[PDB]
Symmetry: D2
Subunit: 359 residues, 4 copies
């Protein structure tokens, strides 16, 4: 178990941006800008800085050219400059490596702390950031698939309860989780800002980055992204969806960028800002938990995820999950799922829902 | 091959209603009225007569209690009373069994002709029908999932070109089809009213009824039907979708009623009323032809369909397809499909798209 | 002064197909129709721009032609066969109308075509032949948040609606809806060939003038987006009326004004009319939900302003003043009234418009 | 000018519920339940307790039968039970009348503090509330017009700067406001939860309640409310909209309940939770500020608002605004508004936009 520090946790506002290493910067630009419509705050021959339609901080996404595609940092904004100091003392007390840069790691961020966190993830904490034009009423720019906010990160980690306790100490409250009746936790969702999630843990070998999620205003905006990817004849880069989640109640889609980094598009989850917000626990065998309509979860969604880097820029070594696998217990050869608890009718044994089996 | 009669074809306006035999009238009522929100025009202990939100003819769907669930009639409205006489002479010249009732077969229809058509389907032709309150502005009744129109039927038949030619003689024009490079036809769509289809042919053992389709105004209406089925914990009755079609360009969903009759929900196809409306032919191996986003077609969609009755109410015998199977050539162990024609990247061999094989 | 039915058979008309609008500044008009509204270019040069909607396969739905005086130059209907163009010629000749036949068309991408000065003074075109183009209906890589997907209809201002209505009925248009009063005045009527509420429509007033051209969207949010865009471009003064729900037609709608004040309607989700006994809906002129279903007031400019039309020489047609009662005056003028519920003074408006104006 | 207390402000989470006095409980039930589809948490012969689709606290709206239709309490939830203590100390230091009930003023709320605030409004602060079934996935109940959350209140008050400074001391941050070039403020919007507003101040004679606002998921849900009210032949109870706001960027509608209490339906404003969220100031003469599409604001929107009660249940006396009137300076006989700043084309003199 990760001890609760004596030092006070930084006051975290929200997820703010990710830095992703990409191998071909031009190909990645074509995906994020030409296909998805994100707005360029800055670019040069090595990096592209991108923001969503309603953002006023400098960026929500930094694409950095490098030899090995990976998550370089997942960044959280904190409430005050002094919270960056608090972060540094907190992670030092945890025994983690930290690096402080008074003028930032990436353009448009000021004083910043990066840490190798206890789960092996590269977190950044910052307050200072260069404000840019907020494009929230620039309907002359608005795309039929417009990405309006950054919503969350999702992390793959082998021991979910261990990670959960550490994030709870850091001030994230769990909104929903998936468990079974044998004491195993498969996933958890946790928040600072008043939505379902700012980050989330998915059980599996890690550290790896499962996805970054962006919001739209409406469900039809997500449908348009699918439609556009069909017209561009890149429907093979639609991994999963579109769907309605059980967990979060959001409408959703998962797509894959040119380095296989997974992006979720997401809308219309609910308010979580009250401190006694009810925590929802789903059973891992409930076939409406991930897709509410019962559509099967593709196996790649469980097995594939991005590398993450350490502070030197080297890939973090992967630690194998020993807890039960969600894939195996639901859609694998000895798996089980139900539509109605206690009913054999609409249940699935050793295969996925809707007439499919594992490839 | 079905010869063209000398007698003129009746002038067909549109598909108008289907009569489905159901085994448990109360459970069927719960599905069509309580789940899907169709409007009752008449009911008694034997039958429920239902209509869509914008309809002014007496009904779009008759549910008739019977021992064996089946299609009893697919009815098309003709332009004038005299067109019922034309239909009778047309089908007599084809050598088909016909039955004429001056006062109709079901309530709210007058002079009507039922036929066992050359493909073994029970067709009705009628002009006269009792008008009802057109509910198109009754927003006090409007559901989040409102079904606004009857759109089309879809028929399973073993020899698609033979059926196509017969329907062309009857004045239906082909809008889209699915073929391979070796001259096999797997499916055809054809219309009288100015939309993609009034009926459609799916290659398979037949005669069987594949589906009846209803329209909504908007895509979110279809999403709501899925969401409601999740809330009612009957997501196992969502067969396939929601999706975007390639063929037709319509947003879609397939669900299964209590007797396994398949219902499609459908919106936003295109205008076909010009006589040189361009036909569109898709290759059977194009993985965007049925779901534009490349989501896999569930095998039940290819194999399962409803029995049809003859004019005495007995089940029509099935005649096996000998042309190639769309299921087998796309998703079976020897099948394949592509995302981009000629590209191995995004192609699937011996399994379906997105990482599944057949259950 | 009835327009007598010809003995010659009517051409078989499929639908409204395109309008040719004369515009005074081509570049400004191009800005509006292409950059603001997102219509697709089928051809352009220094004198004309040819534009189509997202789902169209014929060459165009709108031609913008540079000229000295902004006006409707032609409203074009597609007919079912080449022989229908001959039928149109014989029909209008019997009506005593001026006609002009060009075997190779009046505009690019149309072939054999007849233009006529019709009995109501409007320049109608009938054609079959048209160059097919790429149908963009699945080009979601081009699709705009405000995408205009079909041409839907025209609306014509004319002084005597019954006279025009019977003429259009003889030509095969069927009336789907109208607005009347108890004293027997007709204020407006809507009529169709294709299976929607309208291909053209008559608005009572001084005419001939073109009231608007209407394009469809897929969904209501597409119309909202057009409004939002116009706010961002700081041209919200060119939003004339709406967005709303129509009473007549039940469609979601918006009216906007191009740089020459040609009015364009955006329209979605009316109903099917293809059955020959489609029930005809009559509204009372004093029903305040007949035009906007939510009872929002109709601005006076909607009733009084409309585009000039040209004769076949390119000269503006002289205007004939309506003598029948004016819808504006009987509903929102000094002696007008409307109601929310018939016979109920609560929610009625007298000598003014709804909502407090 | 209202002084900043030495005592710490309570930590306010969000607007949580309003108590409205209504004169005919059955007619108000028909409006809020049958027309608008709100969910009944509890009802008896004197009160109806209603909640939105996604709520888990006991209610968002209490309709209380009484002789004079009015706002009885606007309630905000606080982070902890101790924040109710802090609220009491805070308001006592301001010299405000307070009343504290350990078992609540209405069903489903526990220990609660009501105050007559410095602007004459009845505020409630509470933490404890009875949790109920959160209906957020009950799509078997979901209406085409579904109201999914309580969003905000809007208060009419004569001196906006005075009220603004007080709410800021209380921890509300201003997100947007409307001013002119003569130094007058006409309105301000301010928040605790990460949306544009939890309450808002509209310059005018006050204290009065301008509206209570509920959210939908999508714009079509707001359109459906309009369509339904047309079908019910109660379109005369649509006051203004639907529209897109300038201020807030939300899609909106204003309708009137049986006692003329104004309800806004609202969707798709933006995130404000960062402490340096940029404040946006509109000019009062900008004809896109309230309706982005330039549609005219009906005079009744500026002049009509609900009475509010004091802690004894008596109507609060109204104090006259002496600052310039938004109505008069934009749409009155000497009013002015513009589409484009500095452009005479698309400007309006002595009248409202669009031709009225
Ligand atoms: O004015 C109204 O609102 C009625 C009406 C209905 C349909 C239309 O297309 C139109 O232009 C006008
Ligand atoms: Cl999921
Ligand atoms: Cl299909
Ligand atoms: Cl406003
Ligand atoms: Fe996620
Ligand atoms: Fe179909
Ligand atoms: Fe129109
Ligand atoms: Fe408001």
């Amino acid at each position: 178990e990760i001890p609760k520090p004596v030092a006070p946790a930084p006051d975290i506002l929200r997820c703010a941006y990710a830095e992703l290493v990409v191998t071909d910067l031009a190909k990645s630009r074509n995906f994020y800008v030409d296909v998805l419509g994100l707005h360029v705050s800055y670019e040069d021959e090595n990096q592209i800085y991108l923001r969503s339609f309603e953002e006023f901080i400098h960026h929500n996404l930094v694409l950095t050219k490098g030899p090995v595609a990976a998550l370089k940092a997942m960044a959280f904004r904190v409430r005050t400059p002094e919270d960056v100091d608090k972060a540094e003392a907190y992670y030092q007390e945890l025994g983690c490596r930290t690096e402080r840069r008074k003028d930032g790691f990436v353009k448009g961020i000021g004083d910043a702390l990066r840490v190798e966190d206890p789960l092996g993830f590269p977190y950044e904490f910052f307050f200072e950031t260069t404000h840019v034009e907020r494009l929230h009423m620039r309907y002359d720019l608005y795309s039929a698939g417009e990405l309006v906010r950054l919503d969350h990160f999702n992390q793959v980690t082998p021991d979910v309860p261990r990670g959960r306790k550490y994030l709870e100490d850091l001030g994230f409250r769990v909104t929903e989780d998936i468990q079974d009746d044998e004491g195993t936790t498969y996933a958890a969702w946790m928040h600072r800002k008043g939505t379902v999630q700012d980050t989330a843990l998915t059980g599996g070998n890690g550290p790896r980055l499962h996805h970054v999620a962006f919001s739209t205003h409406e469900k039809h905006n997500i449908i348009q992204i699918c439609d556009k990817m069909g017209a561009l004849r890149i429907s093979d880069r639609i991994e999963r969806g579109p769907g309605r989640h059980g967990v979060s109640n959001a409408f959703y889609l998962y797509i894959l960028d040119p380095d296989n980094h997974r992006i979720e598009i997401y809308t219309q989850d609910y308010y979580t800002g009250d401190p006694d917000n009810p925590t929802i626990t789903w059973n891992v065998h409930d076939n409406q938990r991930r897709d509410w309509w019962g559509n099967p979860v593709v196996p790649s969604w469980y097995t594939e995820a991005s590398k993450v880097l350490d502070l030197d820029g080297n890939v973090q070594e992967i630690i194998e999950r020993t807890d039960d696998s969600e894939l195996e217990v639901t859609i694998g050869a000895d798996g089980f799922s139900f539509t109605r608890a206690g009913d054999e009718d609409g249940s699935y044994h050793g295969q996925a829902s809707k007439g499919f089996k594992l490839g």
